[PDB]
Coordinates of C-alpha atoms in Angstrom, one line a residue:
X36 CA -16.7 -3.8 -11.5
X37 CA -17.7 -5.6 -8.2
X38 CA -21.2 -7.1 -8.0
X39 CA -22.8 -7.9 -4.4
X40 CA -24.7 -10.9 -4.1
X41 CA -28.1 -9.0 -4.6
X42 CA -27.3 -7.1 -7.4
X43 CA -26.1 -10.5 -8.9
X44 CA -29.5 -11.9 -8.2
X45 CA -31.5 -8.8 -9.4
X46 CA -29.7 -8.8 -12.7
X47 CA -29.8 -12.6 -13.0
X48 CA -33.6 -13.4 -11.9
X49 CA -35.5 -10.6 -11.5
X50 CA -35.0 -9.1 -15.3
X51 CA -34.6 -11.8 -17.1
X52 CA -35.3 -11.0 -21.1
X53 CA -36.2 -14.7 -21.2
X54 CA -39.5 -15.7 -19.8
X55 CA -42.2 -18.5 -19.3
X56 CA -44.7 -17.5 -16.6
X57 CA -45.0 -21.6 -16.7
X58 CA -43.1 -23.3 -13.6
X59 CA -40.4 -20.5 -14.2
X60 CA -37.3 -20.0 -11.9
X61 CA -36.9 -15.9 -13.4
X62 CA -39.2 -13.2 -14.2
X63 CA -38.9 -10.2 -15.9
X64 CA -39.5 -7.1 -13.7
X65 CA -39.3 -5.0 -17.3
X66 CA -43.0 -5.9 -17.7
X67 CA -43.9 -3.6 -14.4
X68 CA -41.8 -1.2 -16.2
X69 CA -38.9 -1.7 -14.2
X70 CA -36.0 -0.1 -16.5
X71 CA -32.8 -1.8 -15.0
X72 CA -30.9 -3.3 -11.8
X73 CA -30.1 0.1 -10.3
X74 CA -34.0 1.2 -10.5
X75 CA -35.4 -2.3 -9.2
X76 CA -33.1 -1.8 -6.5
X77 CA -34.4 1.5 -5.6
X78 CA -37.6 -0.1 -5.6
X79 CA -36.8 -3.0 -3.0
X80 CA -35.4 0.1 -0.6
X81 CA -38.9 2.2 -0.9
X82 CA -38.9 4.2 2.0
X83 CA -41.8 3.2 4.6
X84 CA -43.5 6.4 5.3
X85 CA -45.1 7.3 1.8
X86 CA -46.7 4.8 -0.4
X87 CA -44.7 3.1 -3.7
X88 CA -45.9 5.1 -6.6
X89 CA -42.7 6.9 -7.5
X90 CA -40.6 3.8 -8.2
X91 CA -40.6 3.9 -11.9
X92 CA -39.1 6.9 -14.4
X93 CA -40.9 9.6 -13.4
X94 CA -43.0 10.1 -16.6
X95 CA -43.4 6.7 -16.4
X96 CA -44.4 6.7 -12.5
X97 CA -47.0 9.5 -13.4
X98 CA -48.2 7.6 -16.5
X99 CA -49.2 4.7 -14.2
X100 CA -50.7 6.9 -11.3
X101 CA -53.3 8.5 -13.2
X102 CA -55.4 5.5 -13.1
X103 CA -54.9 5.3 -9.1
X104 CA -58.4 7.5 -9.3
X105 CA -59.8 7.0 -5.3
X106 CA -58.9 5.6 -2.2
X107 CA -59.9 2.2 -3.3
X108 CA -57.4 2.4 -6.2
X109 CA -54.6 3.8 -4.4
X110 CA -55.7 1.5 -1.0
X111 CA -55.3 -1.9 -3.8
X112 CA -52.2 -0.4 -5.5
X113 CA -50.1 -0.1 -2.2
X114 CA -50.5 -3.2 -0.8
X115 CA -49.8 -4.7 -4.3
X116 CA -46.6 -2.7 -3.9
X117 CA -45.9 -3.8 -0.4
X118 CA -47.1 -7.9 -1.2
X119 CA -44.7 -7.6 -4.3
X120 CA -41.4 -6.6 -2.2
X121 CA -42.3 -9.2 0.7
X122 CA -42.2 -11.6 -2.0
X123 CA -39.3 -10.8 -4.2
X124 CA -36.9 -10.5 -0.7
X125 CA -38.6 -13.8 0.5
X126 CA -37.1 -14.9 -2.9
X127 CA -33.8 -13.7 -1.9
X128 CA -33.5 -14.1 1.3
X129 CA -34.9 -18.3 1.3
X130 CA -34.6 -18.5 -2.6
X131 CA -37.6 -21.3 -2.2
X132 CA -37.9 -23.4 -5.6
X133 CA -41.3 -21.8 -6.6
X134 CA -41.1 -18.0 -5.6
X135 CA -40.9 -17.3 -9.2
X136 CA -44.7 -18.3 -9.4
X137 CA -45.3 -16.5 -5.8
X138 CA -44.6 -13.3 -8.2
X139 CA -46.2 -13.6 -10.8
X140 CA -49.9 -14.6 -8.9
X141 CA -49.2 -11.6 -7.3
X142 CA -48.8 -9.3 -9.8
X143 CA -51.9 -11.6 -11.7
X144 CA -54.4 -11.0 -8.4
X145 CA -53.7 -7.2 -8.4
X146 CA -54.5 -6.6 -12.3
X147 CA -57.6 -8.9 -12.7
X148 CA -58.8 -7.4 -9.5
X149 CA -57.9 -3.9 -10.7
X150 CA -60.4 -4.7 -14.0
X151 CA -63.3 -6.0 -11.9
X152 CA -63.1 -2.7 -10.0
X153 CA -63.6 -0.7 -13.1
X154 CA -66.1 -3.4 -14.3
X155 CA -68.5 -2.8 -11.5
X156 CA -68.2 0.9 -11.8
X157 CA -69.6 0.8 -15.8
X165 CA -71.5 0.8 -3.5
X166 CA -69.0 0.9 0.3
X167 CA -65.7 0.5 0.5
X168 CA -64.3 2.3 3.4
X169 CA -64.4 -0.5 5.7
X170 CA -62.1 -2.5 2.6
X171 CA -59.6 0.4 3.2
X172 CA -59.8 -0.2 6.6
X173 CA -58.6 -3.2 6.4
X174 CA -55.6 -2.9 4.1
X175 CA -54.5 -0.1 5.9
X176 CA -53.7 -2.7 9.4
X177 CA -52.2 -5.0 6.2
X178 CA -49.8 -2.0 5.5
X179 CA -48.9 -1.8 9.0
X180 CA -47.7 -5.4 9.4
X181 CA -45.6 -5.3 6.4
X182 CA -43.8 -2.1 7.8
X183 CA -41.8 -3.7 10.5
X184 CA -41.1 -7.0 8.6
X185 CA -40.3 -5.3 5.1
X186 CA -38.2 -2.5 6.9
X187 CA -36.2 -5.4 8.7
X188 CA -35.4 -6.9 4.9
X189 CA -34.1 -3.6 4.0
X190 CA -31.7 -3.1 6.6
X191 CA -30.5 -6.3 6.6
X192 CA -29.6 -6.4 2.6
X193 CA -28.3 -3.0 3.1
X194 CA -25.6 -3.8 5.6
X195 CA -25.3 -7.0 3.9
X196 CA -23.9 -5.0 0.2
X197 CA -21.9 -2.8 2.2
X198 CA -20.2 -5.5 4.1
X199 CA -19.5 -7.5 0.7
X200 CA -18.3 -4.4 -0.8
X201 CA -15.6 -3.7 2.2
X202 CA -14.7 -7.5 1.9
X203 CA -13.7 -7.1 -2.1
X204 CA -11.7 -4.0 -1.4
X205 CA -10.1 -5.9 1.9
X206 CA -8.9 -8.7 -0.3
X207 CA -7.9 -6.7 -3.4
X208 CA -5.6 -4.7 -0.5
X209 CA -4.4 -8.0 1.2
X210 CA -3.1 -9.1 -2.6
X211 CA -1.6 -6.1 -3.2
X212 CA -0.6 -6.0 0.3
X213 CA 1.1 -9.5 0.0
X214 CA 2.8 -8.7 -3.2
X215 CA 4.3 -5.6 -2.3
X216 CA 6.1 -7.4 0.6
X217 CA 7.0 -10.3 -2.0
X218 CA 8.7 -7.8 -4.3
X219 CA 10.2 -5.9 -1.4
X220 CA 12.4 -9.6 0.1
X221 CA 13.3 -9.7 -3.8
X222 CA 15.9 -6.7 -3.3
X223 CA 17.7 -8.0 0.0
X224 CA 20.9 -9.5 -0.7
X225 CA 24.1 -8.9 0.5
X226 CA 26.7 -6.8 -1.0
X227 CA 28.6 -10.2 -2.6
X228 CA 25.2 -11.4 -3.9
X229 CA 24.1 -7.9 -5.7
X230 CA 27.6 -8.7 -7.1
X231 CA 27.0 -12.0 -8.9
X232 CA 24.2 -10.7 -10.3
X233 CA 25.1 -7.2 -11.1
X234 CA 24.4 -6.0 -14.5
X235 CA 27.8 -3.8 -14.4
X236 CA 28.2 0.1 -15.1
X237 CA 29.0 0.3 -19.1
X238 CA 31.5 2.5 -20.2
X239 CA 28.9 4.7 -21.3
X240 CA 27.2 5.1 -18.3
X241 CA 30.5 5.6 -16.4
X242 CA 31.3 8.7 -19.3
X243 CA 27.3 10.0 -18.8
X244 CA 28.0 9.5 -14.7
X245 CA 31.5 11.4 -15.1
X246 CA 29.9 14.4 -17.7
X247 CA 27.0 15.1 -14.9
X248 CA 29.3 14.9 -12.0
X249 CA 31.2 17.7 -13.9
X250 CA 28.1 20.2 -14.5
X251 CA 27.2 19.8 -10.8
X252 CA 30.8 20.4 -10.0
X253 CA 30.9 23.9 -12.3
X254 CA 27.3 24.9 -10.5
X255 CA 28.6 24.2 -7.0
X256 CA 31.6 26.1 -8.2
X257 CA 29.6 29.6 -9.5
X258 CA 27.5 29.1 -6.2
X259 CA 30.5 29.6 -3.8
X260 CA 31.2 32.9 -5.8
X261 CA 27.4 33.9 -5.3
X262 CA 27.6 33.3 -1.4
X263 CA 31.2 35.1 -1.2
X264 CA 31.8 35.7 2.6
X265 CA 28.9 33.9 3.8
X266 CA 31.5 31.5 5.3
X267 CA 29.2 28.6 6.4
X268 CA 27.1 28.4 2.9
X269 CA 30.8 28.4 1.6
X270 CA 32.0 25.9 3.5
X271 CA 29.0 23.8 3.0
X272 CA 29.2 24.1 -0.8
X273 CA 33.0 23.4 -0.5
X274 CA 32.3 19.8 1.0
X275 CA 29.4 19.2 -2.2
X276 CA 32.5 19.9 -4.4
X277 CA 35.0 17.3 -2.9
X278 CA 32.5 15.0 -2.3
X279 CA 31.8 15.0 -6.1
X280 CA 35.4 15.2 -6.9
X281 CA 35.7 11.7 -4.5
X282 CA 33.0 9.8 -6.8
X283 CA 34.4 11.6 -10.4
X284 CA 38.1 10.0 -9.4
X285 CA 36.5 6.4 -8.2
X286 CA 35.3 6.6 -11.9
X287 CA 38.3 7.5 -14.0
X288 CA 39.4 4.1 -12.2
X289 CA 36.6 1.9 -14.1
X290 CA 37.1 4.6 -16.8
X291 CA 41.5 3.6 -16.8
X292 CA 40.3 -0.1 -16.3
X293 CA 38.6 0.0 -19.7
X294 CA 40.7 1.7 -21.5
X295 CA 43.6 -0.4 -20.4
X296 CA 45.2 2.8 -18.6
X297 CA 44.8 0.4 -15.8
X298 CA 44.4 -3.3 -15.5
X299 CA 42.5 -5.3 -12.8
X300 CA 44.1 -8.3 -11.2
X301 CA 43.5 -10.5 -8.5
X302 CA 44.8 -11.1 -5.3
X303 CA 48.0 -12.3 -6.8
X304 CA 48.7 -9.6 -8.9
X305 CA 47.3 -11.9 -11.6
X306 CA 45.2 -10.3 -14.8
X307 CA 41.6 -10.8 -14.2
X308 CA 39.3 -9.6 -17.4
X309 CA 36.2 -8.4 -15.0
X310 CA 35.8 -5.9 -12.5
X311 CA 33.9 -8.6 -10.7
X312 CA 37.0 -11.0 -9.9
X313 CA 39.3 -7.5 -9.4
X314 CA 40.7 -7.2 -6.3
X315 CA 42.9 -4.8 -7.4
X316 CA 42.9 -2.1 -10.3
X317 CA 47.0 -1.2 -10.7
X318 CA 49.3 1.3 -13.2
X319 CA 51.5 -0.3 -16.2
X320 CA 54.6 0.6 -13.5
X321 CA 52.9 -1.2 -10.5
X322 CA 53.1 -5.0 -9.3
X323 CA 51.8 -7.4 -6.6
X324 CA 54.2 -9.6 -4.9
X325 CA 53.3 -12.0 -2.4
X326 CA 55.9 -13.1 0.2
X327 CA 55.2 -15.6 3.3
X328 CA 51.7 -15.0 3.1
X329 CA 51.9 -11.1 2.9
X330 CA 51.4 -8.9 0.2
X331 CA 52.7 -5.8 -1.4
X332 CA 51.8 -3.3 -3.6
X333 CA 54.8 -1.9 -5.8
X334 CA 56.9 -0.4 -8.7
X335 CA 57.3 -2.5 -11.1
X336 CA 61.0 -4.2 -10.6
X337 CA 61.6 -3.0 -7.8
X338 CA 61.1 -6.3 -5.3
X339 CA 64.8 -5.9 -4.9
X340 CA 65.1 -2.3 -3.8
X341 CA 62.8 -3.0 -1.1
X342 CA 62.9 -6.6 0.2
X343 CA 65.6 -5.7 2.5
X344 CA 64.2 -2.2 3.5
X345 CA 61.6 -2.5 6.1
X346 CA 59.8 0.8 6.0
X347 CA 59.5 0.2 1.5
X348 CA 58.0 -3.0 3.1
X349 CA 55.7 -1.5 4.8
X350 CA 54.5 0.8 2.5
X351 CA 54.4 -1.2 0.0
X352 CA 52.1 -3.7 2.1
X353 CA 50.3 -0.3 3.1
X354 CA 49.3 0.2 -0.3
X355 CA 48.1 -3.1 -1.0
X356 CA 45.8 -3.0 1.5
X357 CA 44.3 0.9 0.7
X358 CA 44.5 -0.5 -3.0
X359 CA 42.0 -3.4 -2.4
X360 CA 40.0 -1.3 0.0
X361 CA 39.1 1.4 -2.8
X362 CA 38.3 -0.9 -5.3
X363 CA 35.4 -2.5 -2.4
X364 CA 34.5 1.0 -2.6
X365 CA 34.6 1.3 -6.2
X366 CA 32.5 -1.4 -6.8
X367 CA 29.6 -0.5 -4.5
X368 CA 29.7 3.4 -5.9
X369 CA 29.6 1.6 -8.9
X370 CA 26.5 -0.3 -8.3
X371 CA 24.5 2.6 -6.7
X372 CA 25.5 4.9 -9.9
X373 CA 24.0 1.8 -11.9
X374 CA 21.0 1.3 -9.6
X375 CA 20.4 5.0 -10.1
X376 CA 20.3 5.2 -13.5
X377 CA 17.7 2.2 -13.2
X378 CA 15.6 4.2 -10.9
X379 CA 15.5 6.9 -12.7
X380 CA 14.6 5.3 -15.8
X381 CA 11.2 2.9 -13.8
X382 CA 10.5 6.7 -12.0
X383 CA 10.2 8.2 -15.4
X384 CA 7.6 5.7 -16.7
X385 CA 5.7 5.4 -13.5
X386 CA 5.3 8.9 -13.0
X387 CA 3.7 9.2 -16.7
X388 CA 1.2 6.6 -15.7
X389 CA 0.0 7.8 -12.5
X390 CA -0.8 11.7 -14.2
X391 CA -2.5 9.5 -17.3
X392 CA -6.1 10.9 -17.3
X393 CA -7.0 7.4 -18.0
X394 CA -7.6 5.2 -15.1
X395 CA -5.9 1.9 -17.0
X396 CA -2.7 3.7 -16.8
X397 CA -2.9 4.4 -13.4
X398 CA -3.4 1.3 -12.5
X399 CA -0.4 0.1 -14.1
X400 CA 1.8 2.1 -12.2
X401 CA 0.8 0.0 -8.9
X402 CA 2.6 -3.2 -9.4
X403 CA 5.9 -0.8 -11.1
X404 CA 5.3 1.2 -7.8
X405 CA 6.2 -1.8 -5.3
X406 CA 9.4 -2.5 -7.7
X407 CA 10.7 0.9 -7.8
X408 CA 9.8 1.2 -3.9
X409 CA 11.9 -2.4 -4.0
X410 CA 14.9 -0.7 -5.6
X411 CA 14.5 1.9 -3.7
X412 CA 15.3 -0.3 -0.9
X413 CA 18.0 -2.2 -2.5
X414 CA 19.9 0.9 -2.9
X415 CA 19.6 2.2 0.7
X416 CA 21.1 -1.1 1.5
X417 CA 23.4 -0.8 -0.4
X418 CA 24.5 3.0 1.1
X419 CA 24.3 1.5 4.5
X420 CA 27.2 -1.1 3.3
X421 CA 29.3 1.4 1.6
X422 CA 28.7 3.4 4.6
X423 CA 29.7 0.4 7.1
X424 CA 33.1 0.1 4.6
X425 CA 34.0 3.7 4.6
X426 CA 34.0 3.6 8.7
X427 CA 31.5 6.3 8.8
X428 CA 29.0 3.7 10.4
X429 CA 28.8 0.5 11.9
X430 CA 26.1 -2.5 12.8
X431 CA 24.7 -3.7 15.9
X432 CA 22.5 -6.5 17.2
X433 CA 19.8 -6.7 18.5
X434 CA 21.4 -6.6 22.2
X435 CA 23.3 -3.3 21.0
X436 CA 26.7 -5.1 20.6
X437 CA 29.1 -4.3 17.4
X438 CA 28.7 -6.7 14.8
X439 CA 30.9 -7.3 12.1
X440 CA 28.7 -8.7 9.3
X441 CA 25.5 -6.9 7.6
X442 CA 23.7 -10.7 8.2
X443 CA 24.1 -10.1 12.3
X444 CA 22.9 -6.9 12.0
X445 CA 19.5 -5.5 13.5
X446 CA 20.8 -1.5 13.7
X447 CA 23.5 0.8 11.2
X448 CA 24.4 4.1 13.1
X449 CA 27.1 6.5 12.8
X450 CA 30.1 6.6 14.3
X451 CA 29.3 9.8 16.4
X452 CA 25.9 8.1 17.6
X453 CA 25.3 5.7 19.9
X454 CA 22.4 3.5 20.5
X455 CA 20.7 4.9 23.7
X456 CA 18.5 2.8 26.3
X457 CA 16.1 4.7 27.6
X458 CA 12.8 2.4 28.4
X459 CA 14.7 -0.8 27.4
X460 CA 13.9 0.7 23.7
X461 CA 17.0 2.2 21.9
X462 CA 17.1 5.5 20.7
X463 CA 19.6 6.4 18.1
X464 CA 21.1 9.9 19.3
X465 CA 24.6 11.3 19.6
X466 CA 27.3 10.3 21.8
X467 CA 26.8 14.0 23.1
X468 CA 23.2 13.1 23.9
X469 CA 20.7 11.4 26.6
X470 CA 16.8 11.5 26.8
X471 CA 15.5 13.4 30.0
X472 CA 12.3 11.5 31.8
X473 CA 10.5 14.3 33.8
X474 CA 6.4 13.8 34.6
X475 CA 5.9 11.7 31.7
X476 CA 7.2 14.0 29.4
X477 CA 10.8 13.5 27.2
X478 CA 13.6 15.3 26.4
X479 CA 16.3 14.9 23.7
X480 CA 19.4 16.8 25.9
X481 CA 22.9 17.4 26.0
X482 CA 24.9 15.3 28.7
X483 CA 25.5 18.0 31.5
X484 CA 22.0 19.4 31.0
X485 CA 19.4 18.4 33.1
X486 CA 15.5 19.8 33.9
X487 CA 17.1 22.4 36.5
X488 CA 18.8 23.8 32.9
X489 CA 15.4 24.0 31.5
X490 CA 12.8 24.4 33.9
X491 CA 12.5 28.1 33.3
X492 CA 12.2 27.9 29.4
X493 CA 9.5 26.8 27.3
X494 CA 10.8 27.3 24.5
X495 CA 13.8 25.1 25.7
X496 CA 11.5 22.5 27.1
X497 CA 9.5 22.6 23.7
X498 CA 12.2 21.9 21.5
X499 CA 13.4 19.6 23.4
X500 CA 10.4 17.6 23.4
X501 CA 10.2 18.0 19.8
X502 CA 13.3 16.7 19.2
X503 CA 12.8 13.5 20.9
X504 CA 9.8 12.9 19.1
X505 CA 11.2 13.3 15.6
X506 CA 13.3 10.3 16.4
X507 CA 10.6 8.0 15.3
X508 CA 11.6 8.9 11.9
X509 CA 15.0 7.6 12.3
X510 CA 14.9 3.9 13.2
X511 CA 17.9 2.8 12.7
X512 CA 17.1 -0.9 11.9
X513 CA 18.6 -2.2 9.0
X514 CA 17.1 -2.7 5.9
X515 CA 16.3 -6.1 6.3
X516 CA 14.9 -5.7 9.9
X517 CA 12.5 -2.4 8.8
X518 CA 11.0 -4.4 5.9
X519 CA 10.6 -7.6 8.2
X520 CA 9.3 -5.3 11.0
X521 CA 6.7 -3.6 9.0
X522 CA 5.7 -6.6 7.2
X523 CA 4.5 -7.9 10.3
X524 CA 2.7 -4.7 11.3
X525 CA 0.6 -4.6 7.9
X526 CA 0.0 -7.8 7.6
X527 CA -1.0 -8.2 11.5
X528 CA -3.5 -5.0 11.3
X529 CA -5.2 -6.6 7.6
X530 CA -6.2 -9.3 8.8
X531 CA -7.6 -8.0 12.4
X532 CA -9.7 -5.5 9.4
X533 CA -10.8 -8.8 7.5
X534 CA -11.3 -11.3 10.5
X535 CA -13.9 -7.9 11.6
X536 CA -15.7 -8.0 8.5
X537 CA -15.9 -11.7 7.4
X538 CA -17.5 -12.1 11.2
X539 CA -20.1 -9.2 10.7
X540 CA -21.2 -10.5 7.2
X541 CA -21.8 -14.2 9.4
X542 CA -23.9 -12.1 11.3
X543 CA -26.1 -10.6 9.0
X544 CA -26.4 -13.9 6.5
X545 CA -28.1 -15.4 10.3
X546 CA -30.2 -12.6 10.6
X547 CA -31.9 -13.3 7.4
X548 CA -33.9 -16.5 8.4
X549 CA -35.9 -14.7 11.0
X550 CA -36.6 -11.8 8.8
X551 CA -37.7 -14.1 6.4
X552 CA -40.0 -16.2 8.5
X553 CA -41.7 -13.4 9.8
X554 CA -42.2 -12.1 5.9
X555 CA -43.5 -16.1 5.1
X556 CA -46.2 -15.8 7.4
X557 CA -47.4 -12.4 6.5
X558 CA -47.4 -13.5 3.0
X559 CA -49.2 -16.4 3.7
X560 CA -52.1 -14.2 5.9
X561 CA -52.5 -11.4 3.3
X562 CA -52.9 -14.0 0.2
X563 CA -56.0 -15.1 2.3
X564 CA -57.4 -11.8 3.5
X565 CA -56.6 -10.5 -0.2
X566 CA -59.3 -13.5 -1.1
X567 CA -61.5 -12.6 1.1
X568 CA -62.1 -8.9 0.1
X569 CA -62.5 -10.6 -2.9
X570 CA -61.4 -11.1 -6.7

């Protein structure tokens, strides 16, 4: 996992297995019976109120106290303690070519001096206490300082790892998303198309659902509007199941596709029409008509056979558009379906390296997720139900000029020169900064006198926000620029604070130089 910068250093100088105590750049902190990185660490971040004897394992810690006997010992031990952090974040802080060698005299001084002590006891030293003590004091401030400072210092490199990892992940989630943006002739081109068998397993499901929707209306007998409701399930269903027996006729050779000419065309892809045995396509001064086979004759000469027939044509070519795109949702579907199936696996893994698999499937099922709402909002567009708008709020024709898709029963309301999708029946109220989603012909003299009115109202308006009615295209484009905006305001924060604080360590490490510097004196002075 992620290392900061000081953990780096403690595990790469600090407890070195390899040694030399001559002109060394690394020591090896295992010899003061430092264990491992997390426990010199813990060491470096000693609190300042209470003196350093509980650093090590605690048996350990305990072990090594019992020879801290008087005030003298315990006076001596301390301000090794104290000298010995100064040093080692001097060390990281400058990292000076010889503070290697600063350790290790340290740590030399205190133990030799520590045997002469129990040499001479085989007599004052109060005053020697004394005088450490106003040592301990002027390492508080300037050790304390060193603390805080590497403390913020791993916290901002830890928020900086997990802002990039997101800003990678952010970047490729957007990367996937533009993959899954083509038009409707495009997704065409490149459609993988509906097999037979999935068109047979599409048709058999469509048929259960049918038989449930069927029992259901028997269930809610009388309860008109569940009825009705169900009713509309059941043609809907019967719609798709007969756009299907189509591609299911076209396979079989019940019916044959041809193109605008009435020519045989072997794909579905180069179709514009899929016709009966006892139909034909005749064109005629640029017109064309849809007809029984032979029968040109019979109704050259009749205008309204003409016009039917020309009629025909046209609805002919028109379902088969709608065919096609029914087709390529059923397909997409099934795809869906099948990445969902394998995603959802790995996310409830109890093993973390399966979770993180799913991530990178996540963004391409979210992708196709995307591709297929698309691809609704074009079928819709086809079938009349909706249609597209630019930016300005004018009726486009093509998906490519679009910025908005709305239905045919809504209209794109200005309200603070920001359109609100609503129905036609509809207009937003603006009374004392509040907003109301209302009926033409109401007004606030309608609701003035109900809260609940005026609540619900409100509320209404302000579940709009979850109905921007941009297309596709525009809410991934949109949004990509909202992420991406906000990460790197979060990064340029962060990057700028972790600046800061690698500045701040010069003075804090001056001020621990010269204390360093006056201590290895006064230490000489008090003696060997």
């Amino acid at each position: 996992p992620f290392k900061t910068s000081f953990e780096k250093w403690i595990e790469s100088s600090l407890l070195d297995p390899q040694a030399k105590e001559d002109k060394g750049s690394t020591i090896n902190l295992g010899r003061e019976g430092l264990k491992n990185a997390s426990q010199v660490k813990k060491f470096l971040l000693s609190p300042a109120g209470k003196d350093v004897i509980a650093e090590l394992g605690a048996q350990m810690a305990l072990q090594r106290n019992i020879n801290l006997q008087n005030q003298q010992d315990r006076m001596e031990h301390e301000l090794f303690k104290r000298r010995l952090m100064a040093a080692l974040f001097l060390w990281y802080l400058s990292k000076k070519s010889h503070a290697a060698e600063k350790v290790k005299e340290i740590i030399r001084e205190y133990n030799e001096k520590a045997i002469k002590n129990a040499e001479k006891a085989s007599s004052s030293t109060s005053q020697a206490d004394k005088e450490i003590q106003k040592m301990l004091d002027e390492y508080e401030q300037a050790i304390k300082r060193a603390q805080e400072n590497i403390k913020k210092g791993e916290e901002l490199e830890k928020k900086l790892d997990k802002l990039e990892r997101q800003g990678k992940d952010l970047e490729d989630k957007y990367k996937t998303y533009e993959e899954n943006l083509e038009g409707f002739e495009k997704l065409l081109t490149d459609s993988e198309e509906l097999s037979l068998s999935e068109i047979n397993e599409k048709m058999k499901a469509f048929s259960k659902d049918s038989e449930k929707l069927t029992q259901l209306m028997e269930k809610h007998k009388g309860d008109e509007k569940t009825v009705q409701s169900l009713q509309r399930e059941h043609h809907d269903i019967k719609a798709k199941l007969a756009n299907l027996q189509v591609l299911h006729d076209a396979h079989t050779g019940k019916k044959s596709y041809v193109n605008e000419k009435g020519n045989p065309v072997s794909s579905l892809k180069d179709a514009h029409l899929a016709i009966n045995k006892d139909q034909e396509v005749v064109e005629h001064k640029g017109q064309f008509y849809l007809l029984q086979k032979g029968q040109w004759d019979a109704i050259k000469n009749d205008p309204a056979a003409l016009e039917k027939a020309q009629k025909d044509y046209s609805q002919s070519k028109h379902d088969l558009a709608t065919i096609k795109m029914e087709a390529l949702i059923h397909k997409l579907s099934l795809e869906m379906e099948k990445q969902l199936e394998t995603i959802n696996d790995l996310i409830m893994s109890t093993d973390p390296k399966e979770n993180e698999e799913a991530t990178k499937l996540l963004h391409k099922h979210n992708g196709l997720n995307l591709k297929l709402a698309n691809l609704q909002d074009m079928l819709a567009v086809h079938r009349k139900e909706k249609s597209f708008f630019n930016e300005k709020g004018e009726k486009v024709t093509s998906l490519n000029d679009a910025h908005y898709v709305i239905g045919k029963d809504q209209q794109l309301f200005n309200l603070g020169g920001k359109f609100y999708p609503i129905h036609k029946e509809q207009k937003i109220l603006e009374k004392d900064g509040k907003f109301y989603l209302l009926k033409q012909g109401e007004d606030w003299e309608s609701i003035k006198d109900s809260p609940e009115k005026q609540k619900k109202a409100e509320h209404d308006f302000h579940k709009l926000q979850y109905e921007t009615p941009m297309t596709v295209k525009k809410l991934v484009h949109h949004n990509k620029g909202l992420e991406t905006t906000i990460h790197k305001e979060r990064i340029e924060e962060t990057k700028q604070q972790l600046e800061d604080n690698g500045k701040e360590k010069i003075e804090i490490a001056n001020n621990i130089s010269k204390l360093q510097s006056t201590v290895g004196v006064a230490l000489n002075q008090l003696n060997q």
